[PDB]
Amino acid sequence: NPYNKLFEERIIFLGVQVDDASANDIMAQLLVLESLDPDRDITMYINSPGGGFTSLMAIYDTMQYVRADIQTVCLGQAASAAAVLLAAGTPGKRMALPNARVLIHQPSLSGVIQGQFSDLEIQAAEIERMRTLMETTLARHTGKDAGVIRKDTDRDKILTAEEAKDYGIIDTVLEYRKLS
Amino acid sequence: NPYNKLFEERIIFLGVQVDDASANDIMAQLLVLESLDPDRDITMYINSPGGGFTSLMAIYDTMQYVRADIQTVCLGQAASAAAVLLAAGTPGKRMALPNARVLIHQPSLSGVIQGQFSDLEIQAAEIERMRTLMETTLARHTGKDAGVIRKDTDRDKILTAEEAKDYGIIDTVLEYRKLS
Amino acid sequence: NPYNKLFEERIIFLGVQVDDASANDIMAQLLVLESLDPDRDITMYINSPGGGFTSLMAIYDTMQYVRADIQTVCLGQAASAAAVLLAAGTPGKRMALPNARVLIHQPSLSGVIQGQFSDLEIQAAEIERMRTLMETTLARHTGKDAGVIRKDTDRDKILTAEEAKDYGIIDTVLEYRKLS
Amino acid sequence: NPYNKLFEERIIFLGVQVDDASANDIMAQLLVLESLDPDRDITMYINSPGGGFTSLMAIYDTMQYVRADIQTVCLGQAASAAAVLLAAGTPGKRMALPNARVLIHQPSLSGVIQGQFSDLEIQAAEIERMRTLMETTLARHTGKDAGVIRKDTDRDKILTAEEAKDYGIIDTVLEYRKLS
Amino acid sequence: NPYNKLFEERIIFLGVQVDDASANDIMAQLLVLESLDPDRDITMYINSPGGGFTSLMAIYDTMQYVRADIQTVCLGQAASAAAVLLAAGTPGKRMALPNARVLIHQPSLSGVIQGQFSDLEIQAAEIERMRTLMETTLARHTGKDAGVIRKDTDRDKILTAEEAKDYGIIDTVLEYRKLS
Amino acid sequence: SLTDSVYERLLSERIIFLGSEVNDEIANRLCAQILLLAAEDASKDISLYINSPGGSISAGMAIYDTMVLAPCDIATYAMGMAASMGEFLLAAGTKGKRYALPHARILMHQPLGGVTGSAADIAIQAEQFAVIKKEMFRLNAEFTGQPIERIEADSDRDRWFTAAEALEYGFVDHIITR
Amino acid sequence: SLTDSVYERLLSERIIFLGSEVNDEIANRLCAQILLLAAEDASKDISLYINSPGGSISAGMAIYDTMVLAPCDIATYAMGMAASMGEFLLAAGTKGKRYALPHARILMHQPLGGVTGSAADIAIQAEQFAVIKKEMFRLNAEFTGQPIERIEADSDRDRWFTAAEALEYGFVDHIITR
Amino acid sequence: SLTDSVYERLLSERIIFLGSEVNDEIANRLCAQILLLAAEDASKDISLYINSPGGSISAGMAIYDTMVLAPCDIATYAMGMAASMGEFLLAAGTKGKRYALPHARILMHQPLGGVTGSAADIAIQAEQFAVIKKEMFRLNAEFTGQPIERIEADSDRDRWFTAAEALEYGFVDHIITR
Amino acid sequence: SLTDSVYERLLSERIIFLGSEVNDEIANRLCAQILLLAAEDASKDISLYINSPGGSISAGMAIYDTMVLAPCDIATYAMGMAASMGEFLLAAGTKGKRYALPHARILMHQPLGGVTGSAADIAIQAEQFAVIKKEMFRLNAEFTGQPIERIEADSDRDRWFTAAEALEYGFVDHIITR
Ligand SMILES: CC(C)C[C@H](NC(=O)[C@H](Cc1ccccc1)NC(=O)c1cnccn1)B(O)O
Ligand SMILES: CC(C)C[C@H](NC(=O)[C@H](Cc1ccccc1)NC(=O)c1cnccn1)B(O)O
Ligand SMILES: CC(C)C[C@H](NC(=O)[C@H](Cc1ccccc1)NC(=O)c1cnccn1)B(O)O
Ligand SMILES: CC(C)C[C@H](NC(=O)[C@H](Cc1ccccc1)NC(=O)c1cnccn1)B(O)O
Ligand SMILES: CC(C)C[C@H](NC(=O)[C@H](Cc1ccccc1)NC(=O)c1cnccn1)B(O)O
Ligand SMILES: CC(C)C[C@H](NC(=O)[C@H](Cc1ccccc1)NC(=O)c1cnccn1)B(O)O
Ligand SMILES: CC(C)C[C@H](NC(=O)[C@H](Cc1ccccc1)NC(=O)c1cnccn1)B(O)O
Ligand SMILES: CC(C)C[C@H](NC(=O)[C@H](Cc1ccccc1)NC(=O)c1cnccn1)B(O)O
Ligand SMILES: CC(C)C[C@H](NC(=O)[C@H](Cc1ccccc1)NC(=O)c1cnccn1)B(O)O
């Protein structure tokens, strides 16, 4: 299994939709590699369309909680929660390969949450809190103001690898190191 | 498998919806780790939207029954049954990482339970008993009155990690221990 | 696998819906542990909503047939067939953790059994025989009269762990043995 | 497993639809074989109808990022994203067996992306950027102008192995080396 | 596993519908057995209704590319793509057991390919190219003219094993070698 | 519709049709047609032609009570199929006016149903299935002029009748041979 | 349609039909028919023939209030099936004018429903289920002339009645024996 | 249809029916019926009988604005069920002419809805849910003659009313006891 | 049907209804109603009451062009809901004759759609979405008397209006307070 061989080389794939099953897989892999060696860098290759905000912040907190530095490299896409997890890497260690796209947007409810307006007021204050928490999370990791994140993530803002470097989501557009 | 490696380090994931299959997985893992060493702390990382009340109280009783202390750390979300299981940890050992949300709410029936009104009177006295038992369970673990839990869980009360610490659901907002 | 580790410590989960696949798993586990040692107690942790009456009486007879004593502990719920299997444990060895609920009710046909009225008369004499056999089974294990079981299981009678102890379904509300 | 035996001989199949699950399998296999030996050629046998553009550029960047040369051989079809990954091989090392077809076409959205026209303007500027990035990627690998790629991929341009060699997608129509 | 035991005796089953998953299984098995020994014959037992033309030509090219001779024996049916792969064996080494049927027919699109008439003109020029390529492939392997293949595969031409020998699809109706 | 118009014109000729599975919808339609024709003339007979695979007992008991309490005679006509409840309503006609067309088929069988819910619900359903079975058999005994023990033994499964067999059994009184 | 035409012609004869499951659609149809017939003549009786498996309480309470507040008497007719709400509306007829056809069946049982939503929603539903059950039992007590304790004990599950059993229980006042 | 004919004949008697879930289809039907009856005679009252489980706010606000801006009084009649929007339109009747039939049930609760889309879309939906909730509560305050704080506390979940409880709360003005 | 009859009688009173989602079916129905009423009398106003959640732009542009090129004035009436295209057609009325009932709600937002097919197809769809958005905003600018920059900023997501807010914004010209 090439997944297990890269895991022994401290390489993790965020390669699927960020849901609770994916989040538990990342958090188990992050906490094992913290317990294996807290000094060596964990590499988090991210090819993901994003997903749930809770599973986002489950991975986000675990990336920030573990003693090991998290090298986030984007490959193909980091959209939504995955763009935030891409920005959630250790500063100086956030990469994207040159043709990876980075989609940042405000949080959204999938489908329709029914309920009384008092329940919907709480669901809306929560998705506004999820919006504010995402923008605050993207503020401290991109170096931009949270109001700048709010205007930019008002709709879909797809960045290239170069544009995500200028935005502060990654730190280095990862050059191709092919020998030929 | 990073799940098995963390289990050998006495770390359990409540990472899925709390149903009977998930509850049996937690209770087997809690009772093995009690039989391995009853003195070392069991760590219960909780990333869960909650679920059934019976599977809640199956995990709840097993967390309280085992001789080992249960370190509940919330990662991402501890909602519904999972918020109660988060509060069900050993006092002083209930954590949440800073961007984990804690949703407390009264119990609910998923879908519609049909039946005669005598059957529905019993199903309603049961969901009221499930409501009272949840509030009494959250009373002894958060330090608040059960009537305070009843007013607060009347609708969805989403807490942050700091707000769940002030509420008494966790004991410590778990600081990021990253070396850099 | 924590299921296999507890099975080596003679611990069985009735953790799913009691159907024929679940019953065959319990009966195989009961008859192996009888053949391993017929003198040591088998512990049957029960977290189940119940199920079919035949798979109930398949587990019931096997619990009573094996030479080993069956320690039934209820965790979360023992509803329907699972409440009878909870009461089916060895006397003095039937437990429930304090927030486990015990639902006793009369048998029921899931869905509609179509057929001629002569076929339906037999299906009704059978579900009445299943009703009488359940009440007679709950009579000898709870110490109550079968007519008392009939009035109590006429609709859903959810008991707490204390109420199932007074009813005779368990023998001891199993105290939490946590060291702290 | 013949997949694992060829992987030990540094042979990778792009044999399914290029989605994120397929892309993560290719990228794990490319980065293990880079870590095994960065000097030996990786052979990428491509039998694929293509797929998503992000998973395309995830594989594309990883093929270009790894230190090992990527020998892309087309077998049967290299369509859409798979034609670009076929052209993404190391120059001089891009093959197609003689009856493999190579389908190049502009990117497309599967199904209908609903939304407000401001959201659709961004989705259209993105699929135009995906169109321009594909044509620029096919420009540097086929040696043709990106405007020539735009006129040729305006609709489906199915090439044979010989026609993909003249187009620049492969470098050699791979002759049959059967001894008889 | 009898599949693995025959694979060690250099025996491959084309036993399912020829799609890309089946084609990748055949091509991996053909290229491993080429790398194991390029001089010993690969036996390809074919029981298949055919399938996709790309996965046909993926297997076809791989059968012709590998250094080992491919002994195609038809068992039951070699229909459509599978009849072409049956004819694709090494000359003198193409068999069919006596009650295997061989169905040759022109290519077809499964279901309806929608689109503009300019897109449909390309899809029709492609299925005509797939028709011409199949007939040219069946021309060089059966020894008949491609116009003879076109008249014969205009509709379903089911051959017996004897009729496929006279047609040139196989070379020998494989006699039963039972000792009794 | 034309099919509603042709049924309307034979409703004017006091000819009504049990022409489908007797559910509550067409039973209330037939009961209203019997009430309307008894309100027009209480003396002229209503012809009920029955091409029916059977159906609900209480829907057929609604038709049966409307047939009896109508002051005019209900001539019943087995036309092709009189099965189950349509058999019942065929034999429920006025004595001497129960007719079978010669190639109509008559199916008499014990009632069909379903048990569901809890065991106490099913025990009540069983008691009521025994009451429905006894009343369906007693009325078929009253219609055919045969004992309820013969009705119970013969209806235990599907018992089919030709027009001649339904004549000798007692479902009909004549076979129309125009 | 013909079936709408035959119901229209008996609407002219002040004969209306509770002939299906009483939902809101046919209750408002029946309420409008009672209002229309009370507007035509406030003195002549409305015949409500009931072939009904029951249904919604508030739809039946809509019919029941329209039956009482009509100045003309509502003669109710158990025709085949008067179950649940159709039992209620049968027994809701004018006293002395509640009729059962002899093979109609009367089913009296406590109301059916569903609980859903949060525990505070279900507790409100339970309080309202206790109010609906008490008002359904008090009115069935008022209809049948029997105590509410007997109505509560008998409606606890499905209690079936023949026309004779519904006569002695008090759902109907006579059995039509024309 | 007969059911359209009976509603048409009571439309001639200025009796209209909110007899289903108030969606846009029957609201525009009721609004057109109020406009048609106000065009016939601007002085005679329109009787709106309400057997409704509630429904859309804007569909009910369409009916409510058509009720008020009609120059003739809209007598509202709780018939069985006046829930949610049907409660609103019941209490939206002309003061002194809001009637509850004695076993009608009145359900007052805060509006139901759904949130969907992005967080900026949901924040706009929430602001509009707060505007709809405030206007539904202010108008229920204006109808019942009770404070908006009492309307907000009572509508927080489902609050059920009998005809007597809806009389003292202020949804209706009388209980019809003919 | 009755609902078609009541709409027909208000069609005689030159009152038409945008009472559903404006798709092509009811737009051609409304366009034919505007053409028919302009053929009857070219001087008397057509009242278009709008209870609409919006819908297709070209279906609404069909109605809008039929409203303008009718020689008679189209009085528009926000009745409950004028959202999206129904907002547009409300504001598309004759100036001075655009009316909002006091509790109608007006939703103005940029058009909804979908992108599909190849990138060259979507680029054409995007160019046409920019043309539809500009023409929807320019006409809403012409209707409300406000700049297209304010229309573009306000329609970027859902912007809801009361009748008073739609009065000051310019969708309607009066609020009916009979
Ligand atoms: C923008 C970033 C933070 C995340 C994006 N979406 C969200 O915020 C997600 C979208 C989603 C995913 C799966 C299931 C349901 C909803 N939102 C949430 O998880 C969510 C959960 N509860 C309340 C409100 N929002 B991403 O998935 O497009
Ligand atoms: C509030 C806490 C205690 C738990 C929350 N919900 C419940 O209480 C759950 C929700 C649920 C989950 C799965 C299947 C059916 C119902 N309620 C129950 O399990 C339940 C079971 N029986 C009767 C009444 N309620 B959580 O899942 O949102
Ligand atoms: C009351 C106890 C003894 C058992 C309860 N239910 C039953 O009795 C079960 C419910 C059930 C479960 C699965 C499939 C079909 C029916 N009844 C039966 O198994 C059953 C089987 N054959 C005839 C009559 N009843 B429990 O599952 O709620
Ligand atoms: C032409 C090459 C670059 C790729 C071709 N198609 C695309 O570009 C694919 C087709 C596709 C595949 C899977 C799921 C959804 C869409 N386009 C995309 O992936 C895509 C994704 N986001 C926005 C716009 N396009 B191929 O798959 O036909
Ligand atoms: C005649 C021989 C060459 C192959 C026969 N059929 C084809 O040619 C197949 C039938 C097929 C199979 C799977 C999915 C779609 C279509 N044709 C193709 O694969 C195909 C693919 N793209 C364009 C045109 N034809 B066989 O499968 O009946
Ligand atoms: C008339 C009798 C003797 C024979 C058959 N009739 C029945 O028994 C019918 C068949 C049927 C029709 C509609 C819905 C459900 C069931 N059974 C009933 O109506 C029925 C069943 N159980 C209790 C009460 N009534 B016939 O329909 O084949
Ligand atoms: C009349 C009573 C006593 C018996 C039965 N009626 C009910 O209880 C009916 C059955 C029904 C019909 C339609 C939709 C939902 C439920 N129940 C209700 O209408 C109902 C249930 N819970 C609260 C309020 N109303 B009957 O329909 O079997
Ligand atoms: C009248 C109020 C207070 C109570 C309920 N009404 C609503 O809230 C209705 C229920 C409904 C009906 C049809 C479609 C969607 C939703 N809600 C709405 O119409 C609604 C919801 N959110 C925003 C605007 N309108 B009633 O229907 O139970
Ligand atoms: C009127 C505008 C500003 C707002 C909304 N209307 C639209 O944009 C409508 C919504 C709709 C209705 C039916 C079928 C498809 C789409 N969009 C279109 O008709 C449309 C979308 N893209 C291109 C051309 N027309 B309204 O319906 O919410």
PDB file of C-alpha atoms in Angstrom, chain G residues 4 7-8 11 24-25 28-29 31-33 35-36 40 58-59 61-62 64-66 69 118 120-121 124 128 131-132 135 138-139, chain H residues 1-3 5-7 9-10 13 15 17-20 49 51 53 79-81 101-105 157-158 160 162 176-178:
ATOM      1  CA  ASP G   4     -70.368  12.787  -9.264  1.00  0.00           C
ATOM      2  CA  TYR G   7     -74.050  11.866  -5.714  1.00  0.00           C
ATOM      3  CA  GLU G   8     -75.464  15.134  -7.085  1.00  0.00           C
ATOM      4  CA  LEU G  11     -77.729  15.623  -2.873  1.00  0.00           C
ATOM      5  CA  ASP G  24     -59.786  17.531   5.108  1.00  0.00           C
ATOM      6  CA  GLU G  25     -60.810  17.344   1.431  1.00  0.00           C
ATOM      7  CA  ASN G  28     -64.974  20.350   3.616  1.00  0.00           C
ATOM      8  CA  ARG G  29     -66.975  18.697   0.833  1.00  0.00           C
ATOM      9  CA  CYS G  31     -69.476  20.451   5.442  1.00  0.00           C
ATOM     10  CA  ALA G  32     -70.329  22.411   2.306  1.00  0.00           C
ATOM     11  CA  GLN G  33     -73.026  19.862   1.462  1.00  0.00           C
ATOM     12  CA  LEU G  35     -74.431  24.025   4.660  1.00  0.00           C
ATOM     13  CA  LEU G  36     -75.977  23.911   1.189  1.00  0.00           C
ATOM     14  CA  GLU G  40     -82.169  25.020   0.817  1.00  0.00           C
ATOM     15  CA  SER G  58     -60.397  17.743  13.157  1.00  0.00           C
ATOM     16  CA  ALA G  59     -61.798  16.877   9.731  1.00  0.00           C
ATOM     17  CA  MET G  61     -64.915  17.534  14.108  1.00  0.00           C
ATOM     18  CA  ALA G  62     -65.498  19.903  11.198  1.00  0.00           C
ATOM     19  CA  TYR G  64     -69.575  17.085  13.512  1.00  0.00           C
ATOM     20  CA  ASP G  65     -69.868  20.812  14.174  1.00  0.00           C
ATOM     21  CA  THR G  66     -71.491  21.287  10.774  1.00  0.00           C
ATOM     22  CA  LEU G  69     -75.140  23.629  13.950  1.00  0.00           C
ATOM     23  CA  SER G 118     -38.132  17.731  19.927  1.00  0.00           C
ATOM     24  CA  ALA G 120     -40.862  19.895  24.107  1.00  0.00           C
ATOM     25  CA  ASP G 121     -42.797  19.580  20.840  1.00  0.00           C
ATOM     26  CA  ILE G 124     -47.214  19.622  23.639  1.00  0.00           C
ATOM     27  CA  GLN G 128     -53.048  17.859  22.888  1.00  0.00           C
ATOM     28  CA  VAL G 131     -57.217  16.787  25.011  1.00  0.00           C
ATOM     29  CA  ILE G 132     -58.286  15.188  21.708  1.00  0.00           C
ATOM     30  CA  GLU G 135     -63.017  15.206  23.779  1.00  0.00           C
ATOM     31  CA  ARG G 138     -66.646  12.683  26.058  1.00  0.00           C
ATOM     32  CA  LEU G 139     -68.530  13.144  22.798  1.00  0.00           C
TER      33      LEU G 139
ATOM     34  CA  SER H   1     -67.192  17.955 -10.413  1.00  0.00           C
ATOM     35  CA  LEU H   2     -69.751  17.810  -7.615  1.00  0.00           C
ATOM     36  CA  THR H   3     -67.317  19.187  -5.022  1.00  0.00           C
ATOM     37  CA  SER H   5     -70.399  22.537  -7.789  1.00  0.00           C
ATOM     38  CA  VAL H   6     -71.227  22.608  -4.068  1.00  0.00           C
ATOM     39  CA  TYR H   7     -68.475  25.170  -3.459  1.00  0.00           C
ATOM     40  CA  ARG H   9     -73.396  27.177  -4.921  1.00  0.00           C
ATOM     41  CA  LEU H  10     -72.090  28.413  -1.573  1.00  0.00           C
ATOM     42  CA  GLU H  13     -74.318  32.375  -0.917  1.00  0.00           C
ATOM     43  CA  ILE H  15     -69.555  31.254   1.643  1.00  0.00           C
ATOM     44  CA  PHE H  17     -63.691  27.764   2.146  1.00  0.00           C
ATOM     45  CA  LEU H  18     -60.114  27.774   3.362  1.00  0.00           C
ATOM     46  CA  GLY H  19     -60.347  24.013   3.360  1.00  0.00           C
ATOM     47  CA  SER H  20     -56.783  22.836   2.801  1.00  0.00           C
ATOM     48  CA  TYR H  49     -65.014  28.776   6.739  1.00  0.00           C
ATOM     49  CA  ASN H  51     -60.568  23.955   7.909  1.00  0.00           C
ATOM     50  CA  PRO H  53     -53.633  23.040   8.745  1.00  0.00           C
ATOM     51  CA  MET H  79     -64.416  24.654  11.316  1.00  0.00           C
ATOM     52  CA  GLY H  80     -62.476  21.748  12.775  1.00  0.00           C
ATOM     53  CA  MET H  81     -58.955  23.092  12.330  1.00  0.00           C
ATOM     54  CA  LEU H 101     -67.451  26.180  15.805  1.00  0.00           C
ATOM     55  CA  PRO H 102     -67.443  24.585  19.282  1.00  0.00           C
ATOM     56  CA  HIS H 103     -65.111  21.655  18.570  1.00  0.00           C
ATOM     57  CA  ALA H 104     -62.801  23.409  16.132  1.00  0.00           C
ATOM     58  CA  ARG H 105     -59.173  23.527  17.179  1.00  0.00           C
ATOM     59  CA  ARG H 157     -43.869  26.177  19.903  1.00  0.00           C
ATOM     60  CA  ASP H 158     -47.314  24.759  19.021  1.00  0.00           C
ATOM     61  CA  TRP H 160     -53.363  24.599  20.748  1.00  0.00           C
ATOM     62  CA  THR H 162     -60.230  24.842  21.858  1.00  0.00           C
ATOM     63  CA  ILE H 176     -71.660  29.278  17.227  1.00  0.00           C
ATOM     64  CA  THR H 177     -74.240  27.501  19.396  1.00  0.00           C
ATOM     65  CA  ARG H 178     -77.262  27.103  17.082  1.00  0.00           C
TER      66      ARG H 178
END
